[PDB]
PDB file of C-alpha atoms in Angstrom:
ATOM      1  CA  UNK A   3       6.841  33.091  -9.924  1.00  0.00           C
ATOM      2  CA  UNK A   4       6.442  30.139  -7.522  1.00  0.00           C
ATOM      3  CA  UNK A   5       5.294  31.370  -4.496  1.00  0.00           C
ATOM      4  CA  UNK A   6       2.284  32.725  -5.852  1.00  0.00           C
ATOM      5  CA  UNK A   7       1.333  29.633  -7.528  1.00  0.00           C
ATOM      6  CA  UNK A   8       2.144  27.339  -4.159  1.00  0.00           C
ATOM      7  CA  UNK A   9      -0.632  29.768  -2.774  1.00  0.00           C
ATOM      8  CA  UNK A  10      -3.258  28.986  -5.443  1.00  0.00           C
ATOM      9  CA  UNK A  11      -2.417  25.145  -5.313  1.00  0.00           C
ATOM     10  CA  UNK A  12      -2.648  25.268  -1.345  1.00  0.00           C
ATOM     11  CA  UNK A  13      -6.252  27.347  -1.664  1.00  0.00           C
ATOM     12  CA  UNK A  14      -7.956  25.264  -4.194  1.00  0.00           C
ATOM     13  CA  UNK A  15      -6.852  22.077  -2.489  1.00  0.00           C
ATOM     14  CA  UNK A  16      -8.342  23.302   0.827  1.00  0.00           C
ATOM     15  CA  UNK A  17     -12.011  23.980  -0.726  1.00  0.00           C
ATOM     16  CA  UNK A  18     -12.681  20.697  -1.655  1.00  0.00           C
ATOM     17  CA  UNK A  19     -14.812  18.297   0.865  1.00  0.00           C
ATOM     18  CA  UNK A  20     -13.078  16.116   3.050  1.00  0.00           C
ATOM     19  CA  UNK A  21      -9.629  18.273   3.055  1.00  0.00           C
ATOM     20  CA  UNK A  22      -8.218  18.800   6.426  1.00  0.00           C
ATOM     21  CA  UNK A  23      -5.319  21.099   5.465  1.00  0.00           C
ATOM     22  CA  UNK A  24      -2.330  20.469   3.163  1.00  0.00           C
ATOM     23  CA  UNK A  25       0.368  18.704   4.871  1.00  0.00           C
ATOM     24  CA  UNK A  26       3.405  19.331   2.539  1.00  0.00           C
ATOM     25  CA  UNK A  27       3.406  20.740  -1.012  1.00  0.00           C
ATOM     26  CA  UNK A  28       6.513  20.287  -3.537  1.00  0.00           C
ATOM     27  CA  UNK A  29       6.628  22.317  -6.783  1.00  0.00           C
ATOM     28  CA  UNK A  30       8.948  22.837  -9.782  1.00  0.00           C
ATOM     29  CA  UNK A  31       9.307  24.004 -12.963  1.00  0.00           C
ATOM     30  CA  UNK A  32      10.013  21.475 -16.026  1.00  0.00           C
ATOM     31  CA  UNK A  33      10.304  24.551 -18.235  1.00  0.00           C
ATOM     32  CA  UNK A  34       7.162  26.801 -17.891  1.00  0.00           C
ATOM     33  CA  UNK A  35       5.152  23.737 -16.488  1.00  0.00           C
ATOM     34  CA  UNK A  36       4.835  22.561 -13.204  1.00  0.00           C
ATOM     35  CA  UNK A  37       4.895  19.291 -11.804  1.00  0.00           C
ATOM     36  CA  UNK A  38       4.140  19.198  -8.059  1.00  0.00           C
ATOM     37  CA  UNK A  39       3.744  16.407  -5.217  1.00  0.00           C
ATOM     38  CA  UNK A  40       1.445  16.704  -2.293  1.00  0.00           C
ATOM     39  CA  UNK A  41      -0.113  15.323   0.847  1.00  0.00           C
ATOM     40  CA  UNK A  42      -3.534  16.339   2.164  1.00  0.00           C
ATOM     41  CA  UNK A  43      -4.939  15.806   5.565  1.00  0.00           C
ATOM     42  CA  UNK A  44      -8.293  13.856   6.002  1.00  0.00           C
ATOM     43  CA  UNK A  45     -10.342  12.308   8.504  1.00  0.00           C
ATOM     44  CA  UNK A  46      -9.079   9.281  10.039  1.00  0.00           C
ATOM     45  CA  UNK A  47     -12.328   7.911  10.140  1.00  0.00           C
ATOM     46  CA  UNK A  48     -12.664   7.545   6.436  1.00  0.00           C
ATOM     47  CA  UNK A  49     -12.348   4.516   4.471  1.00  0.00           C
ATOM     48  CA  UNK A  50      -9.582   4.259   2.445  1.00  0.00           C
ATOM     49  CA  UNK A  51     -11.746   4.348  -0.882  1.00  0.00           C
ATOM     50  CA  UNK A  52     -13.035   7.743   0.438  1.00  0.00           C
ATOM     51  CA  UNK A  53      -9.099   9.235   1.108  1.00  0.00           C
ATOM     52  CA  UNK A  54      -8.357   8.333  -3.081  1.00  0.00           C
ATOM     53  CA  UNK A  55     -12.454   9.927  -3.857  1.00  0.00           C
ATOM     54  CA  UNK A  56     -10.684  13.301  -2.174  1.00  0.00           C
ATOM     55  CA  UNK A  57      -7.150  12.676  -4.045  1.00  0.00           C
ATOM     56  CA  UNK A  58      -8.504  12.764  -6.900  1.00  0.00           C
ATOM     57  CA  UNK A  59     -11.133  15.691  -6.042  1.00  0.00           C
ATOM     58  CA  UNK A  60      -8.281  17.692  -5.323  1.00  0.00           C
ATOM     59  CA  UNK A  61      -5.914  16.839  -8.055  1.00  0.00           C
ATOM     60  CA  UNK A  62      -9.107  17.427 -10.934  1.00  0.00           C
ATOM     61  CA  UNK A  63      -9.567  21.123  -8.437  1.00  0.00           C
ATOM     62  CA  UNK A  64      -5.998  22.188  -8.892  1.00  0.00           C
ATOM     63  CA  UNK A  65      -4.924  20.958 -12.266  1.00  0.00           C
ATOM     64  CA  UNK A  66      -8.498  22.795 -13.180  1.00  0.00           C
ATOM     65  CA  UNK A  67      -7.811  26.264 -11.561  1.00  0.00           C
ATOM     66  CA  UNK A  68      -3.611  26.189 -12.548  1.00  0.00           C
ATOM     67  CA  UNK A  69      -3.204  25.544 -16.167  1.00  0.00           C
ATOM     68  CA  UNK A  70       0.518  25.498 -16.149  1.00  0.00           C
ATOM     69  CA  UNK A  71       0.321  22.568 -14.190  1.00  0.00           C
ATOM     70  CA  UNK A  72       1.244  19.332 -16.003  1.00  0.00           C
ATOM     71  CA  UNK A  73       1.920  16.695 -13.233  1.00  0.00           C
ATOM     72  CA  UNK A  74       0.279  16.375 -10.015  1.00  0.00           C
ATOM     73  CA  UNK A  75       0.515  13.765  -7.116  1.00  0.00           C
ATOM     74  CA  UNK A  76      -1.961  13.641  -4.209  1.00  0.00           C
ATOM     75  CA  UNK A  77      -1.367  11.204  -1.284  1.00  0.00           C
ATOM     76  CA  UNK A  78      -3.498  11.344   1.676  1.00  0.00           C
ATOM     77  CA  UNK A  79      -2.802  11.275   5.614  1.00  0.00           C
ATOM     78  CA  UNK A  80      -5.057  10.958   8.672  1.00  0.00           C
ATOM     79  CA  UNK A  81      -4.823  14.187  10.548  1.00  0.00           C
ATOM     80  CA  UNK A  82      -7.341  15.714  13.674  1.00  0.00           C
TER      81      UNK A  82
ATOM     82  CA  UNK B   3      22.624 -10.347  -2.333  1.00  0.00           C
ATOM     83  CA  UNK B   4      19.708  -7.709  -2.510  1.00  0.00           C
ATOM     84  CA  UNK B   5      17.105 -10.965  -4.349  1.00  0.00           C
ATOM     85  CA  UNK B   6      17.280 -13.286  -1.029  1.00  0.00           C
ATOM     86  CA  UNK B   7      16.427 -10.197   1.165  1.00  0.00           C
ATOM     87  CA  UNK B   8      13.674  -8.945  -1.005  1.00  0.00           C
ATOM     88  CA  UNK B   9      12.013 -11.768  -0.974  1.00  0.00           C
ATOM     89  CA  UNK B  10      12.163 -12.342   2.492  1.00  0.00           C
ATOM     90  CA  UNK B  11      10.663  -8.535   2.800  1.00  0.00           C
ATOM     91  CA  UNK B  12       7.420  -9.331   1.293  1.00  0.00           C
ATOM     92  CA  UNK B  13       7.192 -12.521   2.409  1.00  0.00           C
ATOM     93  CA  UNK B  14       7.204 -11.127   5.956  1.00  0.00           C
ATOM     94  CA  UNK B  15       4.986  -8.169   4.842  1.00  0.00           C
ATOM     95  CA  UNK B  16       1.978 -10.545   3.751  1.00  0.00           C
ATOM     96  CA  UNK B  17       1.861 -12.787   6.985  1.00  0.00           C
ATOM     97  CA  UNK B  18       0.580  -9.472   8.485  1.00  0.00           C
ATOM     98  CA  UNK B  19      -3.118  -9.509   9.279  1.00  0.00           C
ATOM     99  CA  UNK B  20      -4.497  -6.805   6.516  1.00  0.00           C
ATOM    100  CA  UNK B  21      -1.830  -6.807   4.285  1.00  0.00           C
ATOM    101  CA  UNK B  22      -3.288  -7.451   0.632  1.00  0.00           C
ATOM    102  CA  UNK B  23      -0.342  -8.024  -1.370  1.00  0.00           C
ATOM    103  CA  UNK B  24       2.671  -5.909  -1.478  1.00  0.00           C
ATOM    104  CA  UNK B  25       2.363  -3.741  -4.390  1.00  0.00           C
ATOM    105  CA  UNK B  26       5.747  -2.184  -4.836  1.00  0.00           C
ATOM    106  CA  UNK B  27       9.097  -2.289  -2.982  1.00  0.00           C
ATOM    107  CA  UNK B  28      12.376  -0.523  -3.326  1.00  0.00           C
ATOM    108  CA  UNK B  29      15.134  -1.280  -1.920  1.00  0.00           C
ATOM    109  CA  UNK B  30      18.902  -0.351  -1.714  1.00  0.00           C
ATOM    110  CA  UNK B  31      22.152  -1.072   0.636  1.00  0.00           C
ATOM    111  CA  UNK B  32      23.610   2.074   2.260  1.00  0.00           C
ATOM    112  CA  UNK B  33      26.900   0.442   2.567  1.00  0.00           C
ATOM    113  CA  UNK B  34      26.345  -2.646   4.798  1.00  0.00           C
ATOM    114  CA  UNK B  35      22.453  -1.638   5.765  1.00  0.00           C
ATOM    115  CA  UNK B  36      19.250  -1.845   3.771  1.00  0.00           C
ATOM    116  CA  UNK B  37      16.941   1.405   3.158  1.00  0.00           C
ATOM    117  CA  UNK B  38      13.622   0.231   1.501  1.00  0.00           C
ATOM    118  CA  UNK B  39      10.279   2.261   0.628  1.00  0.00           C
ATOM    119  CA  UNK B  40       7.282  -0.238   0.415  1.00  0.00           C
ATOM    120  CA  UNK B  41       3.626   0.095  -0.568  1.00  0.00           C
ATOM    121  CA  UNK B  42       0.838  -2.504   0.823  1.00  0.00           C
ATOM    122  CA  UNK B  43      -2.635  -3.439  -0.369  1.00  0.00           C
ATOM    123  CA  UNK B  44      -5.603  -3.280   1.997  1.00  0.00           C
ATOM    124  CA  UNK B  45      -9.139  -3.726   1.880  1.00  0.00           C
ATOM    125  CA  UNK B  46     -10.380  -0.445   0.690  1.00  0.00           C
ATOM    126  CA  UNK B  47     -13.391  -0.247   3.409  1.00  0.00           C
ATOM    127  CA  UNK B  48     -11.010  -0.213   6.303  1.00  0.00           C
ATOM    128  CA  UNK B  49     -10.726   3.656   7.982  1.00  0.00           C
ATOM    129  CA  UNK B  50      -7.242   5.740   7.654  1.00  0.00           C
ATOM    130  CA  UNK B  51      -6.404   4.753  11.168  1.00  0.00           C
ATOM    131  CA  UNK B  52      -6.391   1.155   9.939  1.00  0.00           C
ATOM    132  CA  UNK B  53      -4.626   1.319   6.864  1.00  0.00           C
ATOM    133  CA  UNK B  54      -1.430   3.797   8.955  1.00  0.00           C
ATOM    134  CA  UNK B  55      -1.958   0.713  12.067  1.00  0.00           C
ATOM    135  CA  UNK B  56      -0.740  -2.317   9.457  1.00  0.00           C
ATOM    136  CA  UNK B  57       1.253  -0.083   8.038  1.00  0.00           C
ATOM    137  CA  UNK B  58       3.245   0.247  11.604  1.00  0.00           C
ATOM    138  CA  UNK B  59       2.513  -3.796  12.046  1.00  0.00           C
ATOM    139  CA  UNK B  60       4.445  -4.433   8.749  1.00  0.00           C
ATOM    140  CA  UNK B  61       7.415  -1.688   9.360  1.00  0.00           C
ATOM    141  CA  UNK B  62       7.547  -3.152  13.057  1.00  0.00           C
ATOM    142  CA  UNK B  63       7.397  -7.170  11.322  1.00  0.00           C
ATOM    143  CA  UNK B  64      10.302  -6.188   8.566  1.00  0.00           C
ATOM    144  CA  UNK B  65      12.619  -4.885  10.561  1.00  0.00           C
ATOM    145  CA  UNK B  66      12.152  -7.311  13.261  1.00  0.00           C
ATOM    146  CA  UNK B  67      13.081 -10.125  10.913  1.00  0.00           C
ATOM    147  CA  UNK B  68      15.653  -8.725   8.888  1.00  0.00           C
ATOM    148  CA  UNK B  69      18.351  -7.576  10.901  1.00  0.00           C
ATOM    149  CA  UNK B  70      20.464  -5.407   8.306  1.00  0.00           C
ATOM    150  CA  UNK B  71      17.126  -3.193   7.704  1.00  0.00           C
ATOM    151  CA  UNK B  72      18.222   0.724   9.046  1.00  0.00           C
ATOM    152  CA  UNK B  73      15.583   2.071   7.658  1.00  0.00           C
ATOM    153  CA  UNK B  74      11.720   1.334   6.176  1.00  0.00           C
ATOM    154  CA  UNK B  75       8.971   3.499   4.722  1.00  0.00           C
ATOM    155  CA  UNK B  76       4.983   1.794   4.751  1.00  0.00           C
ATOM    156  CA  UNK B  77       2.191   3.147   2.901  1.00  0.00           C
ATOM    157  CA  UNK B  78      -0.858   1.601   1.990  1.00  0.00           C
ATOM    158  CA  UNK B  79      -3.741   1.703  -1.611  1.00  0.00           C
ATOM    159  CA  UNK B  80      -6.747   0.121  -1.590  1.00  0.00           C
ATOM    160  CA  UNK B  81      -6.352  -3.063  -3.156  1.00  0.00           C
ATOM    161  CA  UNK B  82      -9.223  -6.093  -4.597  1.00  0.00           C
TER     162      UNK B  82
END
């Protein structure tokens, strides 16, 4: 069920360089797939082309690690 | 009419210094007031803490100039 799979999203996110934390995290089921929105933290200090390089990083992470995953959306914040 | 107003949304939008384009806007009357989600361009080498400071310049700009505005969302892509 869900809970366990917010958990795996939230930990593979947070390995990937340049994460500072997940902000907010929405998941649901379209069947037995999921589709899920989310916002990471990052460094304030980065450029703008470096907050998408992470976006990306994270969504290729998580879509790689969660297989039932068929739709995800990262957006970025500055956070710390 | 929604049209007029729209157009007078990005038009103040892009007289804001870093503003490159606006890329999407959405908006809707709540009864008498407007709610509207926008998304800017900017120059993909400015820092997170730029892109979230025009991001405040345009929400502050918008609802400055039109009046029946209750309620604006601002986020920013790299752009160019």
């Amino acid at each position: 069920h869900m809970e366990a799979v917010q958990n795996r999203i939230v930990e593979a996110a947070e390995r990937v360089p340049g994460v500072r934390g997940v902000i907010h995290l929405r998941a649901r089921y379209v069947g037995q797939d999921i589709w899920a929105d989310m916002i990471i933290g990052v460094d304030p200090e980065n450029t703008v082309e470096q907050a998408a390089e992470i976006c990306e990083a994270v969504q290729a992470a998580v879509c790689g690690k969660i297989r039932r995953i068929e739709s995800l959306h990262v957006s970025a914040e500055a956070r710390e």
